[PDB]
Amino acid sequence: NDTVTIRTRKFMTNRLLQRKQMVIDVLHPGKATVPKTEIREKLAKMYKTTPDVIFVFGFRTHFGGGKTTGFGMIYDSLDYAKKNEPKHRLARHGLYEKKKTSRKQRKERKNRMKKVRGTAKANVGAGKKPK
Amino acid sequence: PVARSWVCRKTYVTPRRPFEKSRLDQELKLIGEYGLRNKREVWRVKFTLAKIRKAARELLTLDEKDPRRLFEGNALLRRLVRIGVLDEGKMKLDYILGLKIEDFLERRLQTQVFKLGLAKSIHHARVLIRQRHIRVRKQVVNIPSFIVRLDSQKHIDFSLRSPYGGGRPGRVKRKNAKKGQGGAG
Amino acid sequence: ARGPKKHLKRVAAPKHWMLDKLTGVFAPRPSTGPHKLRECLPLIIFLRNRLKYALTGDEVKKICMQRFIKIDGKVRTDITYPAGFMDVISIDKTGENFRLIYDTKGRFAVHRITPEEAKYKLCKVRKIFVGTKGIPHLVTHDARTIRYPDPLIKVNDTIQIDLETGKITDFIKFDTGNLCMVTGGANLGRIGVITNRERHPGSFDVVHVKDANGNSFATRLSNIFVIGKGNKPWISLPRGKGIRLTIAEERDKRLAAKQSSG
Amino acid sequence: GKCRGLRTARKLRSHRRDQKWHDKQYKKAHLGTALKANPFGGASHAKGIVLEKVGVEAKQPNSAIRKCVRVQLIKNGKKITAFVPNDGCLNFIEENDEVLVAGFGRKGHAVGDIPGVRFKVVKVANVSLLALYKGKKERPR
Amino acid sequence: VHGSLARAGKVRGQTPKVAKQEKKKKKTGRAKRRMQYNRRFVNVVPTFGKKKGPNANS
RNA sequence: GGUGACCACGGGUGACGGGGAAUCAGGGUUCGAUUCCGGAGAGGGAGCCUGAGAAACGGCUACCACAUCCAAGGAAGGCAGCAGGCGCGCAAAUUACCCACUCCCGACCCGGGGAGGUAGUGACGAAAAAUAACAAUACAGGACUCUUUCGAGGCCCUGUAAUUGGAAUGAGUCCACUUUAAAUCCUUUAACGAGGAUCCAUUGGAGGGCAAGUCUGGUGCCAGCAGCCGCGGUAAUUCCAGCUCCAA
Ligand SMILES: [Mg+2]
Ligand SMILES: [Mg+2]
Ligand SMILES: [Mg+2]
Ligand SMILES: [Mg+2]
Ligand SMILES: [Mg+2]
Ligand SMILES: [Mg+2]
Ligand SMILES: [Mg+2]
């Protein structure tokens, strides 16, 4: 916080997804890489936006510390962020719950769905006994 | 299938015969003078020199004012004067063949940081670079074989985080100071 | 194989796509369309690898489903639609239109065009004939066919199709002294004036064409695309004006630009 | 003299591949008789079972008892003789052990004063013979 | 066969076992190259021994 | 009638073809199962249904060879797909996570994909690069210097052993951050982390080829070494060892 500055380059705004995307780099001389939460509050401060619609990712620290470059995408509204954004970035900010079922379990369950023909009760009940 | 690259090459060539007293003595002269780790390092820079000479030979056998010769000859000359192994007044393809291995080893970062007074010996230069105390421009380099360029020549200096530029002395210093103050009243 | 291929390998992709080996194993296999996949540019790589509007395949699909791109004035929801050559890619939300023209180095360029100049398109007639009821028909390189063409148009000529109507505004005859652009082969992306056409019966004709700098180069007849009358082009040209520079001069051009910027 | 005509390439090429059969290396590498006769079957190494321990007299100028083993290969069941190349490594060998056997070093030709032994023992009972000789690891007792 | 395998490993068994003496750790890597570079190039003395070898037993 | 010494036909192939790989004066010689393109096959043959496209095999039918369950009346097979096994061998990995990326399929902005991505085993191989540096004492060495050998120091580099002797760093422990679909690794960065810095560099050699010992003890044509010359029958520069050197 004492000596940490943010700069933005390759900035361009596209209304196609109603967002403004840019490449951001943070200059932290003596600290570690700055956390994403601090980056979002600084970027929202610079662009006069709320620090809950911002997304930052892809942060790589250069060798020897100092600068760290990532990609920052901001939006003109939160609703558009729901419309077009990767679900993992949404879940990072807590705006999207995640499925908690194993892919292997889903394949076994679906294979048991294929085994049962027609009958809805047994089709949805095939995953009950062999848990 | 997979999106891997599989693009690699060897940077060195082993000598055709082993155990020649003349060759072994000459290579050990280069290792001792420029603080090289092993014989592979002098073989790799000999190999890069040989590749440059091979390209220069092929261009020389090519006809005069050939567009391919002029373009690639000027390109190769530009790289040589950029890394400082070839004099700027000596912009000739013939003069490339006169290059040796001594001036290629001269341009290494280990040699340079010794010859700019930042290191007491060539071995002190290598261990300092490996310990990450020397930076070029704004980026700190820990590679002894970093071939420096003429533009980057003037900008070699101690890194800020090292206990030779900015603050933050090393853990040996902090531990020794702690024991000194803790060992008395 | 047993049927048509619906996959495209990344390295097997056309060179002008500028795709890289590391990102993925595959490539955007272009769907069937008005242009051959070997000479097209799929819309996905247009909005992602050229205009940087989208980042991956999912994002570029999002604009298509929001129905913002109008290839030839028609909304296309196909992510891998083969655009092709001299097509007005119009995004009216940003009010920006592009004509997909080859540059100097034989690759599709980001050629911005004014909205008024974006209402028409040049096309090369590939064959003419007469169908039922004695109706003359004409087909173009853009695969679009029109009924009732002007009888003066012969094959390998040029027509000025009009968007939103699909009619002919003007036509250009193919003869010596016309401004053309090479659309295939080594000289792809070059502009010159037709100087000579050698006819080889039973084989492909060879057309010799001279650019504005005096450099004269040959090509096949099928690679010839007339784009103007005399010396004046009928469309806006991409940067470089369709000239070809040998490796000596674009080197010092880059050095001069670096010197001026420094 | 050799024909140098501009249209003699057929005779030059036919004469080359005809005369190439007259040198040993090309003949053995393409006829296939050497491959069939090789107990290893073109393999660098091959495993076998120690039939018995044997001693072979050296050649005329030398005088020693080279320590070898008769070993039949687990593939194709051929009985061969393998040298045991150290000071006391025959003691490590014993009856009915699985031994890795390599060539001796000059491609099916006998080496040194050992008469008619083309092979040497590399590993015995899955542990390296050099490891046993230098005491890095021991026979599983 | 003659049954002369009894003598196998005779000399290696008979050789008395003397342990390796303890010595300082040898320099390795770049420092080892430095040591042998100094041992034969910077201390060159012209002597009537006809350039004795590095392992001379004199 | 057609094809053949301008090599037909036949046989062999440890032959899928090519783009390419290795070696590299030039010319050539080998290798191309292997990620790209084309072909062929799905235990061996054969015949079919549907479909635009199959002679499909994670479609069917029959025979041949194996082989599964049976209440012996019957039924069900195709891992040269990803894992994982047995066998074969000199010879080759996890019965892992995920559609986030590249794309593909679908009625489709939403579903699916052992395609593919990620991680694990991984000294096939390739790139980079630690295992130490510095200072001052002693004794040599240097064109050293001062009287012209004799002694010292106004100088330079190594060496040997030392409370030296206090500077620097990782390899590791380990916080957070970062990456990522979730992780891991890497890069940052807190706190520890070096004086046998015991935080320990090995593999092969020392007669010649071919760099390096006419050292010491044992053996005594034996054991063994030795790619080739050759060594070994009593003080073996060649074996077995110790020390010391050499090569990477
Ligand atoms: Mg075959
Ligand atoms: Mg192949
Ligand atoms: Mg098939
Ligand atoms: Mg159909
Ligand atoms: Mg079938
Ligand atoms: Mg170590
Ligand atoms: Mg010895």
CSV table of N, CA and C in Angstrom, one decimal, chain C residues 99-224:
chain,number,residue,atom,x,y,z
C,99,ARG,N,-13.8,-4.4,-44.8
C,99,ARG,CA,-13.7,-5.2,-46.0
C,99,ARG,C,-12.5,-6.1,-45.9
C,100,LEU,N,-12.8,-7.4,-46.1
C,100,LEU,CA,-11.7,-8.4,-45.9
C,100,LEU,C,-10.9,-8.6,-47.1
C,101,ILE,N,-9.9,-7.8,-47.2
C,101,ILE,CA,-9.0,-7.7,-48.4
C,101,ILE,C,-7.6,-8.2,-47.9
C,102,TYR,N,-6.9,-8.9,-48.8
C,102,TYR,CA,-5.5,-9.3,-48.6
C,102,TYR,C,-4.6,-8.1,-48.5
C,103,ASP,N,-3.6,-8.2,-47.7
C,103,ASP,CA,-2.6,-7.2,-47.6
C,103,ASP,C,-1.4,-7.5,-48.5
C,104,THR,N,-0.3,-6.8,-48.3
C,104,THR,CA,0.9,-7.1,-49.1
C,104,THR,C,1.3,-8.5,-49.1
C,105,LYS,N,1.4,-9.1,-47.9
C,105,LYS,CA,2.0,-10.4,-47.6
C,105,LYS,C,1.0,-11.5,-47.8
C,106,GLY,N,-0.1,-11.3,-48.6
C,106,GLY,CA,-1.0,-12.4,-48.9
C,106,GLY,C,-1.8,-12.9,-47.7
C,107,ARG,N,-2.2,-12.0,-46.8
C,107,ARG,CA,-3.0,-12.4,-45.6
C,107,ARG,C,-4.1,-11.5,-45.5
C,108,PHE,N,-5.2,-12.0,-44.9
C,108,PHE,CA,-6.4,-11.1,-44.7
C,108,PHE,C,-6.1,-10.0,-43.7
C,109,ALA,N,-6.5,-8.8,-44.1
C,109,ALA,CA,-6.1,-7.6,-43.3
C,109,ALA,C,-7.4,-7.1,-42.6
C,110,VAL,N,-7.1,-6.3,-41.6
C,110,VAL,CA,-8.2,-5.5,-40.9
C,110,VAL,C,-8.3,-4.2,-41.6
C,111,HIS,N,-9.1,-4.2,-42.6
C,111,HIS,CA,-9.3,-3.0,-43.5
C,111,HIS,C,-10.6,-2.3,-43.1
C,112,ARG,N,-10.5,-1.3,-42.3
C,112,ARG,CA,-11.7,-0.5,-42.0
C,112,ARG,C,-12.2,0.3,-43.2
C,113,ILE,N,-13.5,0.3,-43.3
C,113,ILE,CA,-14.1,1.0,-44.4
C,113,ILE,C,-15.3,1.9,-43.9
C,114,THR,N,-15.5,3.0,-44.7
C,114,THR,CA,-16.6,3.9,-44.3
C,114,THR,C,-18.0,3.2,-44.5
C,115,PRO,N,-19.0,3.6,-43.7
C,115,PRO,CA,-20.3,3.0,-43.8
C,115,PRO,C,-20.9,3.2,-45.2
C,116,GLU,N,-20.7,4.3,-45.8
C,116,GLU,CA,-21.2,4.5,-47.2
C,116,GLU,C,-20.5,3.6,-48.2
C,117,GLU,N,-19.2,3.4,-48.1
C,117,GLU,CA,-18.5,2.5,-49.0
C,117,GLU,C,-18.8,1.1,-48.7
C,118,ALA,N,-19.4,0.8,-47.6
C,118,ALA,CA,-19.7,-0.6,-47.1
C,118,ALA,C,-21.0,-1.2,-47.7
C,119,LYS,N,-21.7,-0.4,-48.5
C,119,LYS,CA,-23.0,-0.9,-49.0
C,119,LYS,C,-23.0,-1.7,-50.3
C,120,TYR,N,-21.8,-1.9,-50.8
C,120,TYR,CA,-21.6,-2.6,-52.1
C,120,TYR,C,-20.4,-3.5,-52.0
C,121,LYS,N,-20.3,-4.4,-52.9
C,121,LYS,CA,-19.3,-5.4,-52.9
C,121,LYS,C,-18.9,-5.8,-54.4
C,122,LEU,N,-17.7,-6.0,-54.7
C,122,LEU,CA,-17.3,-6.5,-56.0
C,122,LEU,C,-17.2,-8.0,-56.0
C,123,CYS,N,-17.6,-8.6,-57.1
C,123,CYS,CA,-17.6,-10.1,-57.2
C,123,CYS,C,-17.2,-10.4,-58.6
C,124,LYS,N,-16.5,-11.6,-58.7
C,124,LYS,CA,-16.0,-12.1,-60.0
C,124,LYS,C,-16.9,-13.2,-60.5
C,125,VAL,N,-17.5,-13.0,-61.6
C,125,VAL,CA,-18.4,-14.0,-62.2
C,125,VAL,C,-17.5,-15.2,-62.6
C,126,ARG,N,-18.0,-16.4,-62.1
C,126,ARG,CA,-17.2,-17.6,-62.4
C,126,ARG,C,-17.8,-18.4,-63.5
C,127,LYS,N,-19.1,-18.3,-63.8
C,127,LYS,CA,-19.7,-18.9,-65.0
C,127,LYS,C,-21.0,-18.2,-65.3
C,128,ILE,N,-21.4,-18.1,-66.5
C,128,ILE,CA,-22.7,-17.7,-66.9
C,128,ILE,C,-23.3,-18.8,-67.8
C,129,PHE,N,-24.7,-18.8,-67.9
C,129,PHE,CA,-25.4,-19.8,-68.7
C,129,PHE,C,-26.8,-19.3,-68.8
C,130,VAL,N,-27.7,-20.2,-69.4
C,130,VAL,CA,-29.1,-20.0,-69.5
C,130,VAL,C,-29.8,-21.2,-69.0
C,131,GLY,N,-30.8,-20.9,-68.1
C,131,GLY,CA,-31.6,-21.9,-67.5
C,131,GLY,C,-32.9,-22.1,-68.2
C,132,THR,N,-33.9,-22.6,-67.4
C,132,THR,CA,-35.2,-22.8,-67.9
C,132,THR,C,-35.9,-21.5,-68.4
C,133,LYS,N,-36.8,-21.6,-69.3
C,133,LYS,CA,-37.6,-20.5,-69.9
C,133,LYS,C,-36.6,-19.5,-70.5
C,134,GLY,N,-35.5,-19.9,-70.9
C,134,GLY,CA,-34.5,-19.0,-71.6
C,134,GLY,C,-34.1,-17.8,-70.7
C,135,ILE,N,-34.0,-18.1,-69.4
C,135,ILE,CA,-33.6,-17.1,-68.4
C,135,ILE,C,-32.0,-17.1,-68.2
C,136,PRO,N,-31.3,-16.1,-68.5
C,136,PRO,CA,-29.9,-16.1,-68.3
C,136,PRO,C,-29.6,-16.1,-66.8
C,137,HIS,N,-28.6,-16.9,-66.3
C,137,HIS,CA,-28.2,-16.9,-65.0
C,137,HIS,C,-26.7,-16.6,-64.9
C,138,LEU,N,-26.2,-16.1,-63.7
C,138,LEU,CA,-24.9,-15.8,-63.5
C,138,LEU,C,-24.5,-16.2,-62.1
C,139,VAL,N,-23.3,-16.7,-61.9
C,139,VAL,CA,-22.8,-17.1,-60.5
C,139,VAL,C,-21.5,-16.3,-60.3
C,140,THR,N,-21.2,-16.1,-59.0
C,140,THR,CA,-20.1,-15.3,-58.7
C,140,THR,C,-19.1,-16.2,-57.9
C,141,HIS,N,-18.0,-15.6,-57.5
C,141,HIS,CA,-17.0,-16.3,-56.7
C,141,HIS,C,-17.6,-16.4,-55.2
C,142,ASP,N,-18.5,-15.5,-54.9
C,142,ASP,CA,-19.1,-15.5,-53.6
C,142,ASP,C,-20.3,-16.5,-53.6
C,143,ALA,N,-20.4,-17.3,-54.6
C,143,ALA,CA,-21.4,-18.4,-54.8
C,143,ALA,C,-22.8,-17.9,-54.9
C,144,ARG,N,-23.0,-16.6,-54.8
C,144,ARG,CA,-24.4,-16.1,-55.1
C,144,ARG,C,-24.7,-16.0,-56.5
C,145,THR,N,-25.9,-16.4,-56.9
C,145,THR,CA,-26.4,-16.4,-58.2
C,145,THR,C,-27.5,-15.4,-58.4
C,146,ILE,N,-27.5,-14.8,-59.6
C,146,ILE,CA,-28.5,-13.8,-60.0
C,146,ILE,C,-29.2,-14.2,-61.2
C,147,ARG,N,-30.4,-13.9,-61.4
C,147,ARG,CA,-31.2,-14.1,-62.6
C,147,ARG,C,-31.3,-12.8,-63.3
C,148,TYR,N,-31.4,-12.8,-64.7
C,148,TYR,CA,-31.4,-11.7,-65.5
C,148,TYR,C,-30.2,-10.8,-65.4
C,149,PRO,N,-29.0,-11.2,-65.8
C,149,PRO,CA,-27.9,-10.3,-65.8
C,149,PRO,C,-27.8,-9.5,-67.1
C,150,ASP,N,-27.0,-8.5,-67.1
C,150,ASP,CA,-26.8,-7.7,-68.3
C,150,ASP,C,-26.0,-8.6,-69.3
C,151,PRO,N,-26.4,-8.7,-70.5
C,151,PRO,CA,-25.8,-9.5,-71.5
C,151,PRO,C,-24.3,-9.2,-71.8
C,152,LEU,N,-23.9,-7.9,-71.5
C,152,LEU,CA,-22.5,-7.5,-71.7
C,152,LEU,C,-21.5,-8.2,-70.8
C,153,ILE,N,-21.9,-8.7,-69.7
C,153,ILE,CA,-21.0,-9.4,-68.8
C,153,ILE,C,-20.7,-10.8,-69.3
C,154,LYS,N,-19.4,-11.1,-69.5
C,154,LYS,CA,-18.9,-12.4,-69.8
C,154,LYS,C,-18.3,-12.9,-68.6
C,155,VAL,N,-17.7,-14.1,-68.7
C,155,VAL,CA,-17.1,-14.8,-67.6
C,155,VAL,C,-15.8,-14.1,-67.2
C,156,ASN,N,-15.3,-14.4,-66.0
C,156,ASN,CA,-14.1,-13.8,-65.3
C,156,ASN,C,-14.2,-12.2,-65.4
C,157,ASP,N,-15.3,-11.7,-65.4
C,157,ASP,CA,-15.5,-10.2,-65.3
C,157,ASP,C,-15.9,-9.9,-63.8
C,158,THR,N,-16.1,-8.6,-63.6
C,158,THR,CA,-16.4,-8.1,-62.2
C,158,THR,C,-17.8,-7.4,-62.2
C,159,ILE,N,-18.5,-7.5,-61.1
C,159,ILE,CA,-19.8,-6.9,-61.0
C,159,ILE,C,-19.8,-6.2,-59.6
C,160,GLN,N,-20.6,-5.2,-59.5
C,160,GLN,CA,-20.8,-4.4,-58.2
C,160,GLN,C,-22.1,-4.8,-57.6
C,161,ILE,N,-22.2,-6.0,-56.9
C,161,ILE,CA,-23.4,-6.4,-56.2
C,161,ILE,C,-23.7,-5.4,-55.1
C,162,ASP,N,-25.0,-5.2,-54.9
C,162,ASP,CA,-25.5,-4.2,-53.9
C,162,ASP,C,-26.1,-5.0,-52.8
C,163,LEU,N,-25.7,-4.6,-51.6
C,163,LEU,CA,-26.3,-5.3,-50.4
C,163,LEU,C,-27.7,-4.9,-50.2
C,164,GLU,N,-28.5,-5.8,-49.6
C,164,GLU,CA,-29.9,-5.6,-49.2
C,164,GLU,C,-30.8,-5.6,-50.5
C,165,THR,N,-30.2,-5.7,-51.7
C,165,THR,CA,-31.0,-5.8,-52.9
C,165,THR,C,-30.6,-7.0,-53.7
C,166,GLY,N,-29.3,-7.3,-53.7
C,166,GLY,CA,-28.8,-8.4,-54.5
C,166,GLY,C,-28.8,-8.2,-56.0
C,167,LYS,N,-28.6,-6.9,-56.4
C,167,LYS,CA,-28.7,-6.5,-57.8
C,167,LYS,C,-27.3,-6.0,-58.2
C,168,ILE,N,-27.2,-5.7,-59.5
C,168,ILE,CA,-26.0,-5.2,-60.1
C,168,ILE,C,-26.1,-3.7,-60.2
C,169,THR,N,-25.0,-3.0,-59.7
C,169,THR,CA,-24.9,-1.6,-59.8
C,169,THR,C,-24.0,-1.2,-61.0
C,170,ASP,N,-22.9,-1.8,-61.2
C,170,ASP,CA,-22.1,-1.6,-62.4
C,170,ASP,C,-21.2,-2.8,-62.6
C,171,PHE,N,-20.6,-2.9,-63.8
C,171,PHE,CA,-19.8,-4.0,-64.1
C,171,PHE,C,-18.5,-3.5,-64.8
C,172,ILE,N,-17.4,-4.3,-64.6
C,172,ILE,CA,-16.1,-4.1,-65.2
C,172,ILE,C,-15.7,-5.2,-66.1
C,173,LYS,N,-15.4,-4.9,-67.3
C,173,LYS,CA,-14.9,-5.9,-68.2
C,173,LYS,C,-13.4,-6.2,-67.9
C,174,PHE,N,-13.0,-7.5,-68.3
C,174,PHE,CA,-11.7,-7.9,-68.1
C,174,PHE,C,-10.9,-7.8,-69.4
C,175,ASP,N,-10.1,-6.8,-69.6
C,175,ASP,CA,-9.2,-6.6,-70.7
C,175,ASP,C,-8.0,-5.9,-70.3
C,176,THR,N,-7.1,-5.8,-71.3
C,176,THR,CA,-5.8,-5.2,-71.0
C,176,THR,C,-6.0,-3.7,-70.6
C,177,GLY,N,-5.3,-3.3,-69.6
C,177,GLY,CA,-5.4,-1.9,-69.1
C,177,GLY,C,-6.3,-1.8,-67.8
C,178,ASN,N,-6.8,-2.8,-67.3
C,178,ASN,CA,-7.6,-2.8,-66.1
C,178,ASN,C,-6.9,-3.1,-64.8
C,179,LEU,N,-7.3,-2.5,-63.7
C,179,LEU,CA,-6.7,-2.7,-62.4
C,179,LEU,C,-7.2,-3.9,-61.8
C,180,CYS,N,-6.3,-4.8,-61.4
C,180,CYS,CA,-6.7,-6.1,-60.8
C,180,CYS,C,-6.0,-6.4,-59.5
C,181,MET,N,-6.3,-7.4,-58.8
C,181,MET,CA,-5.6,-7.9,-57.6
C,181,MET,C,-5.5,-9.4,-57.7
C,182,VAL,N,-4.3,-9.9,-57.4
C,182,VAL,CA,-4.1,-11.4,-57.4
C,182,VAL,C,-4.6,-12.0,-56.2
C,183,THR,N,-5.5,-13.0,-56.3
C,183,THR,CA,-6.2,-13.6,-55.2
C,183,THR,C,-5.8,-15.1,-55.0
C,184,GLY,N,-4.5,-15.4,-55.2
C,184,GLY,CA,-4.0,-16.7,-55.0
C,184,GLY,C,-2.6,-17.0,-55.5
C,185,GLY,N,-1.9,-17.8,-54.8
C,185,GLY,CA,-0.5,-18.1,-55.3
C,185,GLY,C,0.6,-17.3,-54.6
C,186,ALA,N,1.7,-17.2,-55.3
C,186,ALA,CA,2.9,-16.5,-54.7
C,186,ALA,C,2.6,-15.0,-54.7
C,187,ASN,N,2.0,-14.5,-55.7
C,187,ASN,CA,1.7,-13.0,-55.8
C,187,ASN,C,0.4,-12.6,-55.2
C,188,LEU,N,-0.1,-13.5,-54.3
C,188,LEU,CA,-1.4,-13.2,-53.6
C,188,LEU,C,-1.3,-11.9,-52.8
C,189,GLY,N,-2.3,-11.0,-53.0
C,189,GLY,CA,-2.3,-9.7,-52.3
C,189,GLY,C,-1.6,-8.6,-53.0
C,190,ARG,N,-1.4,-8.7,-54.3
C,190,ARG,CA,-0.7,-7.7,-55.1
C,190,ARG,C,-1.7,-7.1,-56.1
C,191,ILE,N,-1.4,-5.8,-56.4
C,191,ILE,CA,-2.3,-5.0,-57.3
C,191,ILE,C,-1.5,-4.5,-58.5
C,192,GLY,N,-2.1,-4.6,-59.6
C,192,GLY,CA,-1.5,-4.1,-60.8
C,192,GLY,C,-2.4,-3.9,-62.0
C,193,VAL,N,-1.9,-3.5,-63.1
C,193,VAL,CA,-2.7,-3.3,-64.3
C,193,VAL,C,-2.4,-4.4,-65.3
C,194,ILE,N,-3.4,-5.0,-65.9
C,194,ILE,CA,-3.3,-6.1,-66.8
C,194,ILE,C,-2.5,-5.6,-68.0
C,195,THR,N,-1.4,-6.3,-68.4
C,195,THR,CA,-0.6,-6.0,-69.5
C,195,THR,C,-0.8,-7.0,-70.7
C,196,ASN,N,-1.0,-8.2,-70.3
C,196,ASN,CA,-1.0,-9.3,-71.4
C,196,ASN,C,-1.7,-10.5,-70.8
C,197,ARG,N,-2.4,-11.2,-71.7
C,197,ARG,CA,-3.1,-12.5,-71.3
C,197,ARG,C,-2.7,-13.5,-72.4
C,198,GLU,N,-1.9,-14.5,-72.0
C,198,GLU,CA,-1.5,-15.5,-73.0
C,198,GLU,C,-2.5,-16.7,-72.8
C,199,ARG,N,-3.1,-17.0,-73.9
C,199,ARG,CA,-4.1,-18.1,-74.0
C,199,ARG,C,-3.5,-19.4,-74.4
C,200,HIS,N,-3.6,-20.4,-73.5
C,200,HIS,CA,-3.1,-21.7,-73.8
C,200,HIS,C,-4.3,-22.7,-73.9
C,201,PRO,N,-4.7,-23.0,-75.1
C,201,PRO,CA,-5.9,-23.9,-75.3
C,201,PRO,C,-5.7,-25.2,-74.6
C,202,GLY,N,-6.7,-25.7,-73.9
C,202,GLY,CA,-6.7,-26.9,-73.1
C,202,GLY,C,-6.1,-26.8,-71.8
C,203,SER,N,-5.5,-25.6,-71.4
C,203,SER,CA,-4.8,-25.4,-70.2
C,203,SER,C,-5.2,-24.1,-69.5
C,204,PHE,N,-4.6,-23.7,-68.4
C,204,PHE,CA,-4.9,-22.5,-67.8
C,204,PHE,C,-4.1,-21.3,-68.4
C,205,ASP,N,-4.8,-20.2,-68.6
C,205,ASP,CA,-4.2,-19.0,-69.1
C,205,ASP,C,-3.3,-18.4,-68.1
C,206,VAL,N,-2.4,-17.6,-68.6
C,206,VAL,CA,-1.4,-16.9,-67.8
C,206,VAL,C,-1.6,-15.4,-68.1
C,207,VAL,N,-1.7,-14.6,-67.0
C,207,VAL,CA,-1.9,-13.2,-67.1
C,207,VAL,C,-0.7,-12.5,-66.5
C,208,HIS,N,-0.1,-11.6,-67.3
C,208,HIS,CA,1.1,-10.8,-66.9
C,208,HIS,C,0.5,-9.4,-66.5
C,209,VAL,N,0.9,-9.0,-65.3
C,209,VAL,CA,0.3,-7.8,-64.7
C,209,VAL,C,1.5,-6.9,-64.1
C,210,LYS,N,1.4,-5.6,-64.2
C,210,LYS,CA,2.4,-4.7,-63.8
C,210,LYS,C,1.9,-3.8,-62.7
C,211,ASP,N,2.6,-3.7,-61.6
C,211,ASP,CA,2.1,-2.8,-60.5
C,211,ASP,C,2.5,-1.4,-60.8
C,212,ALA,N,2.2,-0.5,-59.9
C,212,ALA,CA,2.5,0.9,-60.1
C,212,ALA,C,4.0,1.2,-60.1
C,213,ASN,N,4.8,0.4,-59.4
C,213,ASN,CA,6.2,0.6,-59.3
C,213,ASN,C,7.0,0.0,-60.5
C,214,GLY,N,6.3,-0.6,-61.5
C,214,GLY,CA,6.9,-1.1,-62.7
C,214,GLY,C,7.3,-2.6,-62.6
C,215,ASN,N,7.2,-3.2,-61.4
C,215,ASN,CA,7.4,-4.6,-61.3
C,215,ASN,C,6.3,-5.4,-61.9
C,216,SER,N,6.7,-6.3,-62.9
C,216,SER,CA,5.8,-7.1,-63.7
C,216,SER,C,5.9,-8.5,-63.2
C,217,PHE,N,4.7,-9.1,-63.0
C,217,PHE,CA,4.7,-10.5,-62.5
C,217,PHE,C,3.5,-11.2,-63.1
C,218,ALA,N,3.6,-12.5,-63.3
C,218,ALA,CA,2.6,-13.3,-63.9
C,218,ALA,C,1.8,-14.1,-62.8
C,219,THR,N,0.7,-14.7,-63.3
C,219,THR,CA,-0.2,-15.5,-62.4
C,219,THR,C,-1.2,-16.2,-63.3
C,220,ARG,N,-1.9,-17.2,-62.7
C,220,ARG,CA,-3.0,-17.8,-63.5
C,220,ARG,C,-4.2,-16.9,-63.7
C,221,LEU,N,-5.0,-17.2,-64.7
C,221,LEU,CA,-6.2,-16.5,-64.9
C,221,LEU,C,-7.2,-16.5,-63.8
C,222,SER,N,-7.3,-17.7,-63.2
C,222,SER,CA,-8.2,-17.9,-62.1
C,222,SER,C,-7.9,-17.1,-60.8
C,223,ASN,N,-6.6,-16.6,-60.7
C,223,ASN,CA,-6.2,-15.8,-59.6
C,223,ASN,C,-6.3,-14.3,-59.9
C,224,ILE,N,-6.9,-14.0,-61.1
C,224,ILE,CA,-7.0,-12.6,-61.5
C,224,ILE,C,-8.4,-12.1,-61.0
